[model samples]
Target: MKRTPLFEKHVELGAKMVDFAGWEMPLYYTSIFEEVMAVRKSVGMFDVSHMGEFLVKGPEAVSFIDFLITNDFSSLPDGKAIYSVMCNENGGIIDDLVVYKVSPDEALMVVNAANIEKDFNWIKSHSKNFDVEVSNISDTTALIAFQGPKAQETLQELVEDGLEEIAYYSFRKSIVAGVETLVSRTGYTGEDGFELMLEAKNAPKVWDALMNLLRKIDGRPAGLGARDVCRLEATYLLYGQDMDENTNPFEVGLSWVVKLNKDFVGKEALLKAKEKVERKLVALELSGKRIARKGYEVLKNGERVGEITSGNFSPTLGKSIALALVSKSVKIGDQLGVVFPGGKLVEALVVKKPFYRGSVRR
Candidate 1:
């Protein structure tokens, strides 16, 4: 399994290593619940260098990106980032990614680790007629996310530029801990945070600095286990588990990112899909502490209606929360049943998304 530059650092921190998408990553530095609480109540940092990055540059960078993903990027100003889903012509989601407009002619795309090769090929193949150059910069890039209510204050000290100036979903090339880093105000934990993208070699230096400061602030270095729970509580969808090539953006409750007015890879199909929506990704509060694991059957009146996409014991909410794609007929306040492996049925109440809302600034 491939290891990040900070793999040894994680091992030194006594992290439990796990194989995630062919990469050896930290499952947790400490207890998952403790790490989760750190992000919710105070601050936490995550070694997210396993994720992929792509640099798209050329005269038609913005135009090419607009045609590639299901989001309005043509009008996106420089330093702004937009979350979008790239889809096949069949309207199936290829990947949900974030594209940062570095300038009018340059942009950076951050993609999931598992979809790096596939997403790169997809982007390259579609770049035939467009005037753009796409390069996979994942190997040379390192990503670290500082997240929580106190994330801004914790990271503000090391950054040369003003952290407050970089609004949510906006980024700027700034010097952080003596390293030139792309400081983006974005995070998966629904907290006010920043994701620092820097050169691979400089990761350890920045990590050491951040960790030293984190120590004074009572912040922990979180791992994948904590990251998973935080994202689920924030209602952020994960690729492969929550969605795949077979799922469309509409089914995953990501239609907000689909700008049907403009032309894109799956615009026409999405236009038709919007009319006859079938399944919807809904939030559920399962009774008891039993986590509704992935693929657990959801039932309505003893009939199978859907299956859990992502579920966990929310440390913030103190309840078993899950996101399931069920029939559109299932409305909020509807009581449903989730079947465990032993055929035991558990009551679940359809509830609003974002089981836990943190201190993320809009």
Candidate 2:
């Protein structure tokens, strides 16, 4: 399995390592429940260096990206970032990503680690008609997430400028621990946090510095196991689970990120799908402690209506929660049953997205 620059540090902290997309990443340091509480009540950090980052620059960057993603980038200004999805010719989701408008001629695209190579080729193949430079920087950079109510305080000490000024989904470059870093006000834990991008060689120093700083602030370091639960509480979609090649943004309740006004790779298909959406993504609150794992059958009155895409016992909410794809006819308050072990079924109800109200100061 591949290891990140912080592999040694995670081992030193006694983290439970597991294979994630061919990378040996930490599952959790202590307990998932405890780590979840740390992020909810205070703060916790994550090593997300495995994510992919690409730079799209040159004269036709805007038009090139406009054709690559489903969102309209024409209205985006410098320093702003927007969530978007890359789609194939058939309008199926290739990967969900964030497009950072660094300048008129440059944009930074952050994609899932597992889809790096595929997304790279997809984007490059379409760039032949436009004047653009696309470079994959995944192996040269690292990503770190500092999240929770105290994230700003923890990040403030590392940068000269106050982190409070950075708006959500916005980013700025600054020096942290003598290393140049791009600090973005983004997170997956549904909390106030910052995602830092810096050189690979400087990742260890940055991790040590932030860890030392967080220690002084009474914060903790979390792992993917806890991150998964946190994101579930937030109703954030996991790439392979809640979304895939067969799913479109409209079907997964992500239509807000899809701009139909602009011409894009999947615009025609998504627009056509808009009028005929067959399924909707819904959040489920289980009635008991029985956890609902992914791919479990979602039944309505003993009939299978859909499938659970992402589910687990939420550490923050102290209950079992899930995100599932169900028929659009399913009502919000409808009762459902999730298949569990031993052929038993657990009761659940459809709830609004984001089972937990995050403390993000948006």
Candidate 3:
């Protein structure tokens, strides 16, 4: 299994390790609930170095990306980031990514950890007409996320300047603790946070420094287990789970990110598909404490309509919540039942996306 630069640090902290997308990563230190509360009440840090980073530059970089992704890239301004998806010819998602406009001719893409090689090859293969150069920098860079309501204050202590000026989805290259790093105002936990990309060699120094700061401030270390629950509470889609190679963006409530005005890869297929989407991704809140698991059948009126993609016990709401792919017939406020592992079923109701509202400034 692949190991991040902080693998040793996680082990040293006595974290419970698990295999995640081929990487031996920390699942949690004590309890996922504890980590969740830390991020909610104060601040927490996460080692996301396993995520992939790609640099695409040259004259045709914007055009290449405009034609490759579902979101409109032509109007994207520098220093801004947008969530998008790369789809196949049939409009199925290959991978969900965040495109960062670094300059007029340069862009940085952050992709899922598991699809690094595949995404690299896919972008390279589609660069024939464009004078573009794509390089996979996942191995050279380290990623860490500091998240919570107090994240800005905690991060400001490490840097020389204040972070209140940084808007959401915007980034700036600055030195933190004398080491240059790219700090983006973004996160997956539905909280105010920044994701930092720095050199691999300086990762441990940064990690130790941040941990020391957090310790002094009574902060905590968050793991993937808590990250999962936090994202689910915010209705953030997990790439492989909520949307896959066989799923459509319009069907999964990501249509807002898809631009029809621009012509790009899978445009024709997606245009035709817009007229016939059968299922939609929806959020559900269960009345009981039984947490739903993935692949469990979703039933409405005693008939199977769809299945749960991601489900968990929400720490914020103190109830079980889930993101499920169900037929369009399953409207908000519709009552449904989810089958549990022990041959038990619990009642749930469809709610809107974003099960919890966060304290994000933007």
Candidate 4:
């Protein structure tokens, strides 16, 4: 298993380690509940250096990216970022990623750790015609997610730019703790946080500086376990579990990210899939506290309609919540059931997504 530059730090902190997408990552430093509450109430940080970064440059950078992803990258202004999914020719999701328009002729793509090799190969396969050069910069780069209600105030202490100057989904190439870092106002936790990207060697100092301030204010260094719960509460989709190569954007509640007006990969097939989306990903609130594990069957009228993709006990809401891809017939407020071990059916109700509205800046 691979390890990030900050692996020793996690070891020093006595974090529970787990194998995640080939990388040994921290599951939790403290209790998952305490870390979750810290982010929802105060602040928290996560070492997301396992994620991959790709730099796309050359004259046709913008054009190449526009044809590669499912979002309107052509309209994305400089210094702005957009969340999008790259689909295969058959309209299946290849990987979900965030693209930052660093310049008119350059862009940075932050892709899932598990899909790094696959995504890099996929990008290369489609680069035959476009005048672009894509470089896999993951090895040399490090990413940190600083999140929660007090994220802004905490980060403002280290960054050169005023935290207020950066807007949501935008970024600034600023100096942070003596290192030039690309600080993007983005996060998966659905909190007011910034995703800082910098050289791998410089991560420890920045992390220490942030943690020093974080400790003074009762913030904690969260882990993957807490990150999972926070994202599910915020309705953020996990690329592998919530979606994969067989699922299209429309099936995962990502139709809005698809721009029909623009010409891009999978456009033809996506147009067809949009009109006939047979299954949909929906949120569920279970009647009991039983955690819905992945692949657990979702029942409608005692018949299997779907399977759970992502599920967990929400420490924030104190309920068992899930995101399941079900038959298109499933609707909000409908009564449903999720089968646990030994064929026990747990009652669940279709509910609105994003179980919690936290302190994310609009």
Model 1: residue 84 alpha-carbon error in angstroms: 0.9
Q: All models: lDDT? A: 0.94, 0.89, 0.89, 0.93
lDDT of candidate 1 over 1-362, digit per residue (tens): 99999999999999999999999999999899999999998888999999999999999999999999999999999999999999999899999999999998899999999999999999999999989999999999999999999999989989999999999999999999999999999999988899999999999999999999999989999999999999999999999989988888999899899999899998888888889889999999999999998899999889888999999889788999999988888889989999999999999999987687889875
Cα-based lDDT at residue 43, candidate 2: 90
Clashes of each: 0, 0, 0, 0
For model 2, state the Cα shift of residue 262 in Å. Answer: 0.5
Q: After superposition, how far is residue 33 of candidate 3 from its true place, in Å?
A: 0.6
Candidate 4 residue pairs in backbone clash? none
Error of 1 at 336 (Å): 0.9
Worst 10 residues of 4 by lDDT: 353-362
Q: Estimate the TM-score of every prediction.
A: 0.99, 0.98, 0.97, 0.99
Q: Which candidate's lDDT is highest?
A: 1
How does residue 157 of candidate 2 score in lDDT?
76
Clashing pairs in 1: none
| lDDT (tens digit, per residue) of candidate 2 on 1-362 | 98888999999999999999989999999888888888898899999999999999899888888888888888788888888888887778999999899888999999988999998999888898899989999999899999998888777877976787789989888888889999999889889999999998999998999899877877889999889999889888889999999998889988988888889898888888899999999999998787788889999999888999998898666788889999988878999998886778899999877788687755
Report the C-alpha lDDT of model 3 over 14-49, residue by residue, as the tens digit. Answer: 999999999999999888999999888888899999
Residue 166 in candidate 3 has what lDDT? 77
Q: What's the lDDT for residue 322 in model 2?
A: 89
| Candidate 1 Cα errors over 4 Å, as ranges | none
